[PDB]
Amino acid sequence: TAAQAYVRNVATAVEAERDPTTGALPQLPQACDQFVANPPASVTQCNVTANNDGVNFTVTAQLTYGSVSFDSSTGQFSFQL
């Protein structure tokens, strides 16, 4: 639950960096800690990547199930096991 919360909060923080004039995303990819400091102990590695549509992004955290993702293009979490 901490890891999922962190992922969603990173996604909020990335969305908050969208250019207010053009709607363009910040420069990606980046470590999640460039958006939200102090990931939980359950998160091993976390990154944010730009989706091919040039508008949306995906936040992915590897845990040590395997990883949890959030895709702004769907507004949904995905979990990989």
TrEMBL record:
Disulfide bonds: 32-46
Protein name, per record: Pilin, type IV, putative
Cytoplasm is among the record's keywords: no
Membrane topology summary: Single-pass membrane protein
Primary localization class, coarse: membrane
Domain Pilin A4 positions: 1-75
Residues of the full protein shown: 40 to 122 of 122
Gene Ontology CC, one term: cell outer membrane
Location of this chain's protein in the cell: Cell outer membrane; Periplasm
Keywords assigned by UniProt, alphabetized: Cell outer membrane, Membrane, Methylation, Periplasm, Transmembrane, Transmembrane helix
